[PDB]
């Protein structure tokens, strides 16, 4: 029954992927950003220069006030609002209606994006990071509790942009080859363990704890591949070395300045592939996902921003990593699956890949404590 959900995501490049939802009775239609990096369902509920529409609680007969405030801070942006519940549906999702917690956004700072076309956020991570505390049941938890929807969803993000959120299962027509699974280390963010990193086939040869300092997560609501400082410096050094044929402004490597080439002449071959090895399902076993330069040079002649950046809160496998892969958030089995997507990245001599099995010893040592 998943065909109805294929292509149910839209977006603008670097501005997030959103799905259409309705809230309230009679249904009010809103576009909702899909965020695996948070756990609150929230919608604009008051005028804002960047909102073309918003939730009007007064017009919904099923709205209930919870008489509690809430604020959610993100890496970029924050908002505050009023908690309540209402009936919610997903037109190009399962044919169900659930009563869900909703934060009505009344004030915000650097959260809404001019021209993004979305008005709210669907936090798909676990209750442990919900605000104000873990007693506020996240939307997907409510969906699973109140309906027969199985406890998993998958995201196919395609690189103006589109994709699919398959709610309740896996659509096998959306990927090729095999799915490779990595354990969800802890149910808060979608936390995973990276056990090895290679650039153009050369191991970065860092203590693998550095890759997960202080966590590694999969976040559809972040654009970039974000790496801890020490890992970021090693990777940039290696990427600079591979592309030293051409020289780039020092601000290019920091994400500030874009770089351009005559349309159709981008020198893809001078930028390396990056392989992230993830902890596998059996003892001493890993697999790798390989990322092409067409993913981490984000298009904005042909002009691009460097979409690998530094983090002080751990690795973030953002949208440019997820794009081109079919990603299964298998909550029921506490694992995340990766496969090559039907909308994969096309290089003439290279290809994005999900490959295994690999043997990797002492993978438990790669987790940060
Ligand atoms: C607020 C987000 C949803 C609206 C924005 C979606 C489009 C922009 C995605 O690009 C970024 C988003 C976030 C952080 C960065 C970043 O690396 N820097 C240095 C600011 C870039 C961010 O905070 N993402 C969060 C949530 O997923 C993590 O907390 C969700």
Let me know whether 118 and 170 are in one domain.
Answer: no
Total domains in the fold of the chain = 2
Let me know whether 213 and 129 are in one domain.
Answer: no
Place of tokens 């103006």: 160
Let me know whether 128 and 183 are in one domain.
Answer: no
> Measured between alpha carbons, how far is 165 from 327 in angstroms, rounded to an integer?
10
Q: Is the CB of 146 under 6 A from ligand 1?
A: no
User: If we measure between CA atoms, which residue out of 190, 167, 147 comes closest to residue 321?
Assistant: 190
User: If we measure between CA atoms, which residue out of 58, 10, 54, 65 comes closest to residue 28?
Assistant: 54
User: If we measure between CA atoms, which residue out of 349, 254, 238, 258 comes closest to residue 300?
Assistant: 258
Q: Which domain holds residue 184?
A: 150-369
Q: How far is the CA of 75 from the centre of ligand 1 (A)?
A: 6
Q: How far is the CA of 223 from the centre of ligand 1 (A)?
A: 7
Residue finishing a domain among 114, 149, 184 = 149
Residues sharing a CB contact under 8 Å with residue 143, sequence separation 6 or more, in sequence order: 94, 96, 98, 100, 149, 167
Neighbours of 128 (CB within 10 A): 13
Residue finishing a domain among 149, 170, 203 = 149
Residue finishing a domain among 95, 117, 149 = 149
Is residue 65 annotated as part of the catalytic site, yes or no?
Answer: no
Residues sharing a CB contact under 8 Å with residue 325, sequence separation 6 or more, in sequence order: 175, 289, 338, 339, 340, 341, 344, 352, 354
Technique of determination = X-ray
Q: Is the CB of 310 under 6 A from ligand 1?
A: no
3-state secondary structure the chain: CHHHHCCCEEECCCCCEEEEEEECCCCEEEEEEEECCCCCEEEECCCCCCCCCCCCHHHCCCCEEEEEEEEEECCCCEEEEEEEEEEEECCCCCCCCEEEEEEEEEEEECCCCCCCCCCEEEECCCHHHCCCCCCCCCHHHHHHHHCCCCCCEEEEEECCEEEEEEECCCCHHHEEEEEEEEECCCECCEECCEEEEEECCEECCCCHHHHHCCCEEECCCCCCEEEEHHHHHHHHHHHHHHCCCCCCCCCCCCCCCCEEECCCCCCHHHCCCEEEEEECCCCCEEEEEEECHHHHEEECCEEEEECEEEECCCEEECHHHHCCEEEEEECCCCEEEEEEECCCCECCCCECEEEEEEECCCHHHHCCC
CATH code for the domain of 45: 2.40.70.10
Is residue 35 annotated as part of the catalytic site, yes or no?
Answer: yes
Let me know whether 196 and 61 are in one domain.
Answer: no
Let me know whether 262 and 334 are in one domain.
Answer: yes
Exposed/middle/buried for residue 151 (C-beta within 10 Å: 0-12, 13-18, 19+): middle
């Amino acid at each position: 029954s998943f065909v109805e959900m294929v292509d149910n995501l839209r977006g603008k490049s670097g501005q997030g992927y959103y799905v259409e939802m309705t809230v309230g009775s009679p249904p009010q239609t809103l576009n909702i950003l899909v965020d695996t990096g948070s756990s609150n369902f929230a919608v604009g509920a008051a005028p804002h220069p960047f909102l073309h529409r918003y939730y009007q609680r007064q017009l919904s007969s099923t709205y209930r006030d919870l008489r509690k405030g809430v604020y959610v801070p993100y890496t970029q942006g924050k908002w505050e609002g009023e908690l309540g519940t209402d009936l919610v549906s997903i037109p190009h999702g399962p044919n169900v209606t659930v009563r869900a917690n909703i934060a009505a956004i009344t004030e915000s700072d650097k959260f809404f994006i001019n021209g993004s076309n979305w008005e709210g956020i669907l936090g798909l991570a676990y209750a442990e990071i919900a605000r104000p505390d873990d007693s506020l049941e996240p939307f997907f938890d409510s969906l699973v509790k109140q309906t027969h929807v199985p406890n998993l969803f998958s995201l196919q993000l395609c690189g103006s942009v589109g994709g699919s959120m398959i709610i309740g299962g896996i659509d096998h027509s959306l990927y090729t080859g095999s799915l490779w699974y990595t354990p969800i280390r802890r149910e808060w963010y979608y936390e995973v363990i990276i056990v090895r990193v290679e650039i153009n086939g050369q191991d970065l040869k860092m203590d693998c704890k550095e890759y997960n300092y202080d966590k590694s997560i999969v976040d559809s609501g972040t654009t970039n591949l974000r790496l801890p400082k020490k890992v970021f410096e090693a990777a940039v050094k290696s990427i600079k070395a591979a592309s030293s044929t051409e020289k780039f402004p020092d601000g290019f490597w920091l994400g500030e300045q874009l770089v351009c080439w005559q349309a159709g002449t981008t020198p893809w071959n001078i930028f390396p592939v990056i392989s992230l090895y993830l902890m596998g399902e059996v003892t001493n076993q890993s697999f790798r996902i390989t990322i092409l330069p067409q993913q981490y040079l984000r298009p904005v002649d042909d002009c691009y921003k460097f979409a690998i950046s530094q983090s002080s809160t751990g690795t973030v496998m953002g949208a440019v990593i997820m794009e081109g892969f079919y990603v299964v958030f298998d909550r029921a089995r506490k694992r995340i699956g990766f496969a090559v997507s039907a909308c994969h990245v096309h290089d003439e001599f290279r290809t994005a890949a999900v490959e295994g099995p690999f043997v990797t010893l002492d993978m438990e040592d790669c987790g940060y404590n």
